[PDB]
């Protein structure tokens, strides 16, 4: 049985050296993604400053835009974004299970979630 | 003419009222079959098992 468990050891060497590869690749993806986010940053900065001073300048509530007007409690949608590739682990279906409890909380008041 | 119109209106309304009543009655007969056969299966199977264990 010696050679076969020896080869299980060798494949565990393989496994460690491949999990290291996945580790470094995901680190490169994290670097590129945070680079893209700080790339889209000044867009965000500009829009929030112009939005803050615009809704400061508006100065009275004669603004009937349907996207913002805080209306009644009908259906409350879920814009949930989830895992990207299934080496996820815990948090990336833990968001799903917290979403399940939020579906429970929306059916508490019975609001007909979407 | 108003009597004829009120007649047809109230008649169709009572017809739909009886339609909903008959739907609830069909669900009531479904409850009849459901509880009857369910308690029947329970009684027959549980009595058979209990008397089987006792005689065993």
């Amino acid at each position: 049985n010696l050679r076969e468990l020896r080869d299980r050891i060798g494949s565990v060497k393989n496994t460690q050296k491949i999990t290291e590869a996945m580790k470094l690749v995901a680190a490169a993806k994290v670097r590129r993604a945070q680079e893209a986010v700080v790339n889209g940053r000044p867009f965000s900065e500009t829009l929030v400053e112009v939005l803050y001073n615009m809704n400061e300048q508006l100065q009275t509530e004669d603004v009937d835009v349907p996207l913002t007007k805080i209306r009644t409690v009908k259906k409350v949608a879920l814009m949930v974004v989830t895992g990207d590739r299934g080496l996820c682990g815990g948090f990336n279906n833990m968001l799903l299970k917290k979403a399940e409890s939020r579906i429970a909380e929306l059916k508490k008041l019975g609001v007909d979630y979407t | 003419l108003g009597d004829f119109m009120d007649k047809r209106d109230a008649s169709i309304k009572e017809q739909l009222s009886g339609v909903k009543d008959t739907s609830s009655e069909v669900k009531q007969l479904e409850e009849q079959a459901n509880a009857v056969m369910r308690a029947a299966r329970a009684e027959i199977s549980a009595a058979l098992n209990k008397m089987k264990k006792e005689t065993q």
Binding site: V12, T15, T19, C88, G89, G90, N93 | -
Partner: protein, 120 residues
């Protein structure tokens, strides 16, 4: 461990323990590598309940008080059915792994759970 000796109830009690714990070992040798949450929700719960039975079988010994410190406890057949029953039904299903650790009686595990929940 035969139904026609221990009662079929105690036989399947021992079964429903053993299936779960053997499954836990079969999952153990691949969970230790590559971590906990790569399982199903089911297999995660089954691991939790298997380790529940595991720490639940930590019988405190009456002669081991002078070695460890805890004055051990005595348990019997009502325990033999009921601790299993609460574990496998899911009555005790939120108290932690310490909350049945080194306590024989399952009611003693419940009181221990009360005490550790009280100390927070």
């Amino acid at each position: 461990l035969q139904p026609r000796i221990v009662g079929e109830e105690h036989y399947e009690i021992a079964q429903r323990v053993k299936e779960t714990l053997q499954r836990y070992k079969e999952l153990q040798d691949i969970i230790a590598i590559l971590g906990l949450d790569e399982l199903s929700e089911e297999d995660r719960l089954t691991v939790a309940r298997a380790r529940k039975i595991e720490r639940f079988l930590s019988q405190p010994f009456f002669v081991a008080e002078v070695f460890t410190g805890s004055p051990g406890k005595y348990v019997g057949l009502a325990e033999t059915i009921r601790g299993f029953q609460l574990i496998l039904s899911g009555e005790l299903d939120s108290l932690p792994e310490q909350a049945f650790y080194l306590v024989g009686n399952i009611d003693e595990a419940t009181a221990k759970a009360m005490n550790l929940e009280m100390e927070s």
